[PDB]
Structure 1
Amino acid sequence: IVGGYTCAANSIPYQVSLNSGSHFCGGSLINSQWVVSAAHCYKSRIQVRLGEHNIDVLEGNEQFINAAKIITHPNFNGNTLDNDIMLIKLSSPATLNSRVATVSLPRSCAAAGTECLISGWGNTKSSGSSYPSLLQCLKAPVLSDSSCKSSYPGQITGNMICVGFLEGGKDSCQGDSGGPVVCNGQLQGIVSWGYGCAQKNKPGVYTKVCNYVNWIQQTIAAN
């Protein structure tokens, strides 16, 4: 997250870190047994780390739970990143407490200008790189579909929303992929892509979660 702030410890209790030797992607706890993330984050083995704030220190709230099943959306396009969504079933249920909690799926798609919270452990620099130990947070509005498509002519599918600031300076970045965009207590976005990070007129592009409620419920009932 570039241009954000360090979240209060454990204030984003649905945020997970996906770990394969190190942190490589974010995800969102949506059921005691399931995490939603970005299909482009796929690996065949993943440890899910819940209740993290400092991914470099054991602070006593962590639950480390291996993935038992990893299911990419059947229409995920690895090139365009259309349908950039996957579900991870935990090998044992997360225990839900103040620091490890589910986030709701969308009632409806978020209107333009809806305020959200974006989080993760991705790069904090727009010049160079710095990877944080502490979870970063960013307040950001959903952008109009017109703004989104004007920034990325021909590239925004119906499964993509833009969230952020057309001026630059405030965006998600590499290592945030798969993590949450939460607006009014609902998961509306998954960190997906952007052209570099925090550039002028290149806002962050996020998987449009409100399109996937059927798929997610279907997948949970089937597995």
Structure 2
Amino acid sequence: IVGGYTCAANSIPYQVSLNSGSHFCGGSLINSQWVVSAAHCYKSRIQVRLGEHNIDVLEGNEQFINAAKIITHPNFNGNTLDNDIMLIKLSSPATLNSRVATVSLPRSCAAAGTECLISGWGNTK
């Protein structure tokens, strides 16, 4: 995130960190059993980390569960990046609590000018 600010600890409870040795991509918990992400983030082995704020320290509120199934969209296109979505099923259901919560899917599409909040541990420069 370039030009952003540091989020309040656990203020984005649906934010997960995809880990394969180190954090490589973000994701969102939309179900106690399912995480949604970007198909271009695909790796055959992935560990999902929930309840994270500082990815470099065990603060205590984290739950690490390996993905059991990773399903990218059948029409995902690597050239155009059309249908850049992937679903990940956890091997064990996450325990929903204060620092770990699901995010609602959309009721409808958003009108232009709608303010949104974007988060992640990506490059800041």
**Fold conserved (TM > 0.5)?**
yes
Question: Identity percentage over the alignment?
Answer: 100
Q: Distance in 1 between matches of 2:36 and 2:60?
A: 24
Distance 1:102 1:60 in 2: 20
In the TM superposition, residue 78 of structure 1 has moved relative to its aligned partner by 1.2
Structure 2 counterpart SS, 1:40? helix
The CA deviation string for residues 167-188 of structure 1, in whole angstroms up to 9 with x for no partner, is xxxxxxxxxxxxxxxxxxxxxx
Moved over 4 A (4+): none
Alpha-carbon distance, 1:57 to partner:
0.1
**What is the rounded CA distance, in whole Å, between the counterparts of 1:110 and 1:61 in structure 2?**
33
Q: Give the superposed CA RMSD.
A: 0.4
* CA deviation profile, 1:63-108 (whole Å, cap 9, x unmatched): 0000000000000001211000000000000000000000000000
3-state SS in 2 of match to 1:99: coil
Query: Structure 1 residue 101 and structure 2 residue 90: aligned?
Result: no
Higher relative helix content: 1
Question: How many pairs align?
Answer: 124
Segments of 5+ residues of structure 1 without an aligned counterpart are 125-223
The two structures have a TM-score, normalised by structure 2, of: 0.99
Distance 1:24 1:63 in 2: 17
Alignment deviations for residues 38-85 of structure 1 (CA, whole Å, 9 cap, x no partner): 000000010000000000000011000000000000000012110000
Question: Could you say which structure has the larger radius of gyration?
Answer: 1
Secondary structure of 1:89's match? strand
Q: Is 1:47 the equivalent of 2:51?
A: no
Whole-angstrom CA distance in 2 between matches of 1:17 and 1:104: 18
> Could you tell me how far apart the structure 2 residues matched to 1:122 and 1:8 are?
17
Q: Which one scores higher on RCO, CA 8 angstroms, separation ≥ 6?
A: 2
